[model samples]
Target: HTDPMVSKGEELFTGVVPILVELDGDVNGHKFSVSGEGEGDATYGKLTLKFICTTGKLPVPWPTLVTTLVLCFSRYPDHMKQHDFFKSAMPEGYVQERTIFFKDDGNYKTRAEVKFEGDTLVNRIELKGIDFKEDGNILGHKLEYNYNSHNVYIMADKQKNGIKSNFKIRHNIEDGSVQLADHYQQNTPIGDGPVLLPDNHYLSTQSKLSKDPNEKRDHMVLLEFVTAAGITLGMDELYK
Candidate 1:
């Protein structure tokens, strides 16, 4: 967690902005629908996104699910308690259980539950399922998000069938930017990377899900967010 302090700007307005987003899309001929709504006051807010599943099942590609969940947990740490999924996690030693999907014919079928545990500086979310006997990892996946007044660090570990992978992201409260770091490779620079969204827009946008180019990497899913500044953060990074 590297931090270069930047000034936190004062808000020019004093009211909350209400947001609503809806989508209907397909992944390899499997169609899915999503609807999300939230409110933000520049500094704090909560978003609740619902993915509609039919016949008690929705088969989301692995990367798509991971990307969606990570952004939900990391986007607004301040108002996490406002959402029921995370509100139950505010208590010390208490655990919250969330159901994500239903139906495991191979590509993740059956009801999925995510377990959440909270501590002083650490919040852990684990996918509850059959453990990988080798390492004893539940569902072979977990996400840890650490935060304080100055910055936030998030790391996710996923393993199964003898193969493993990880994702790292750092958000600086002062600068209001989030860095998607390459921690898996050696000699790779960290925060020297750039910001993907503008400051005001970055803090206010909602992360939207999309398909990735290659079938590689569990199929790296694309994330798109639109800011209050009327800027869309997507493939080109930022578009007016």
Candidate 2:
């Protein structure tokens, strides 16, 4: 999360660019799939991605599922959404239920919210308030979570932390052959690669099924997106 990555992977999925990422597998005897699609306007668009349990029994927790999805790939094209209501890319209609509304209590903050039907985890819209800052930044951070530990995650928008420019994205699917298998770390940074498909070819990734580990598992997944410019605000100002 601290170092950097550099690459020329094309902008595959966005409002303008068509994106379909589905790597199917299973969890606890139920069939599951993680898919992300890009849609919206010519100006401002979005990517909708989620981990769905075909049997409607989402065995995965919300944060880990989300972190896995975010980890599957890196880098987004420019002009994506970053607003208040943009908590998830999965539409409200997909889920059986959603947070009814921000309640009167001060707990209305997004960190307090969690609602995912079908037992699948990791449903979110990628948006945050940018008007408050001069750069009008968005959350361009890497996925933050620990397996078998918590029911939440932290989306560190790569656009913040004084880093900017070149929305680079890389994933751990390093296998050389597309021929697959059924395992938890199916896409765990392939040592060699196939023809090295240009950024534009391929369907949604179908990850093999994996069991939720009992002990906490932490992986420093490879870096994908690199900050084009250095962090915008001072490191001190960013936190305080």
Candidate 3:
């Protein structure tokens, strides 16, 4: 439900564009393998991320887009979500102008108003939540991005239970990869990326997760960057 930085946003989803990226190395031995296909080099690490997207002329059809996301979620939920530092607002429904999330279980029935300021690539961001979502919101509950630190701030009503945190998203020049810190406040890690891929396939991605973790609730995280996209029936066609 956000606008892309590219001028030809209309053509971004006319066909399929694989934003291929390099599999640099690891974080505490967490090396991940990624590509535009449904499958990645399994040997990558505990986190095997596979990204696929339809960015050509318009956003991919809702049914097709959601369906592909479902396939990947069941296959690797954590891999699709970059960080659990904050709740994601995707399946953002048709945001012609504004987007809203109601009593949806995964979204925690969150309510809020958001506005974006720039398109300088995620490398630089400018978002301000005029109205913050509370009643036990995730992370800090409100959103604020700082350009200088290259980080996002999620303010919290800190009482040791509710969260107040900021996840650092960094770009690696040598390998063209973005690293997502464990913003959920856990030592292990929760989300990561927005790494610009080979083609126009720019993706922000990953999360170190489990079969089922109470706090870890993510199916597909394509928030503006689609760390989670594409994996489907005939998905083999995109295989390289």
Candidate 4:
């Protein structure tokens, strides 16, 4: 098993590598190479990967799915405890049989779960009982997962003031990370990389739309990641 420090180092290094993958020979996609470098305060490593397309044609959609899976899983461990509402939403089976933990972030605690299902994996996150100084209010958040055929899907559900909205996202895992695709309502594609949505809008508007609009609605953001190589942290390399 890879050490926790190694994983952390990988993430820190992902923020500095260039080129999600290496393409060779013809631009038509036959044989290709992918490489990345990650480093931590005292650890560093690089991944150089090469693969051949069995049919001599770039696999339709598979590359995208592979990439998406890698990215999503890569970031999963780090952000597990950002909210409080999700901590209390765990299914009974999971709580009783699986490994669970509460992550501390100064004032609040987050609940996270990780499990493997055959060739698939699942992660559920929840957070609740948060205090807001601006309005003296308390709220919660929930996230669910489903993985199949090298594809990953995430749904963000928000609960507040007796209303909720469902925000769904799908990802294609390739190479080493996941890519975002197919958001529920928004018409435009988010991008071919990692994305951060407005928290208020996600919790109050996007999720709320799933139900009656007039009700006290909550918002959510559905993110789809594409590419296993994860987000390109070295944008400067493109210009260099």
Candidate 5:
């Protein structure tokens, strides 16, 4: 069985963090080399990326970023067609929309809206239609969000693909730092110290997929920044 390095309820770093990064590939016929030590954000950290072997210009999105770099470098499966780039602010927060472009299928037509409460992302819902599911098993599913002083809740509605989840998000109210909780209601095994940063924070669903028919694999991407005071953070996706 395949497993992810970082699992639920756990933090990614515990004590004495190590640095490592390995990537070498071609983008649009241009050779690109990426390597580093010490994780965090590449733009600030010791990570280095060099473009060589070609003159002219490579047809690629202007690159120099964080988790966004990893997904782009790997050409991670699943596509996200962002319809509106700007997020209009509300009295409480702002909102934006995008459509899912499954690699296996064309466009999943369903709309996804991200709701924020004064810059803090509080909701991600599948407005309608079939959404991303493993093996192209797209279905009518929904992810509802609700939170209180104690924890954050990503309600896994049973009507949506039969996934009944009661996942809670534990956090520190002072700094707004948050961590994902597991079925056992404990901080996940990944280690700790608010995996989620305070103020100006959100989550990105790269892909909702699974390897086995009976298993569930959801790629929830959280970008850790050296300067956690940015507009755009990172991206991620799941592939079966």
Candidate 6:
């Protein structure tokens, strides 16, 4: 059993709210109203939301109001990522090409193209916008990466040794490096957010311990990371 504080934290983090009450008060045959506003643009990467409650008396409980505020702020990023549907549309072995260039007005621009050929995919990217320090010359850079199914590899020695594998495993063997820009750390008890796992497989026990007579135990762990990009919103829907 976990500590009471830990359990409370888990409940607070994982709790979800789907529907909120709308309070109305009638004063002298007139009704007062509460309203909310949410505005955002994916291209610009901005989101703003506000809730206004107006009534003859206080409308909502303090805890409910606080939770609502938290939920709204949490949902903003999920809304933004959903609008950027391109992130999820990639096919297996998808290749992308991109180019970047600068304009005379000193604006940076990038072009990217992606395609899949057989079990292999290619991506090309180009960037333009940097000015050369020497002569103010506009600068550009291009990069390409090829991804193929063969890039996925398993532990050959494990198979050869006839060890029991608990999970399926694979790796990207692409020659070109595609660095991940966003670094997200997983929150404990997970709450409504995603969990980040390691991409490489880990052993539950050290191999050297198998040969050590004095060793008392072997401890190893296997983990993998999911490459999806998005934000975590509260679990209001599930709670409701």
The digit string of per-residue lDDT tens for model 4 on 1-240 reads: 144433432333344222122222211122322222211111111222222333344312222212211122222222331221121121110211111111220012223232222322233323222222221111111112223223223323332111122232333233333333322211111123212221221221111002224523222112222211122334447877
Candidate 6, residues 1-75: lDDT per residue as tens digits?
A: 133422322232233212222323222233334333333222222223333444433221111121112111121
User: What TM-scores do the predictions have?
Assistant: 0.26, 0.26, 0.19, 0.20, 0.22, 0.20
Lowest lDDT block of 10, candidate 2 = 100-109
Using lDDT as the measure, the top candidate is 1
What TM-score would you give candidate 1 relative to the actual structure?
Answer: 0.26
Show where candidate 2 strays beyond 4 Å: 1-15, 28-31, 39-46, 70-240
Better of 3 and 6 by lDDT: 6
Residue 18 deviation, candidate 6, in Å? 41
Answer with 1 or 6, whichever has the higher lDDT: 1
> Regarding lDDT, does 1 or 3 come out ahead?
1
lDDT of 6: 0.23
TM-score of 3: 0.19
Tens digits of per-residue lDDT, candidate 3, 70-169, equal 1111111232232221222111101111122212111111112211113110001111122322322222222112111222232332232222332443
Give one clash count per candidate, in the order shown. Answer: 6, 43, 23, 53, 10, 30
- As for TM-score, the candidate ahead, 2 or 3, is 2
Query: In candidate 3, residue 205 scores what lDDT?
Result: 39
**Candidate 5, residues 1-240: lDDT per residue as tens digits?**
022211211122222223333333343233433333332222231222222213223222121112212110111111211110111111122222223233332231221222223422232222222323323222211112222222222221222211111223232222343322222111111112222111222122221111224423221122232211223334422331
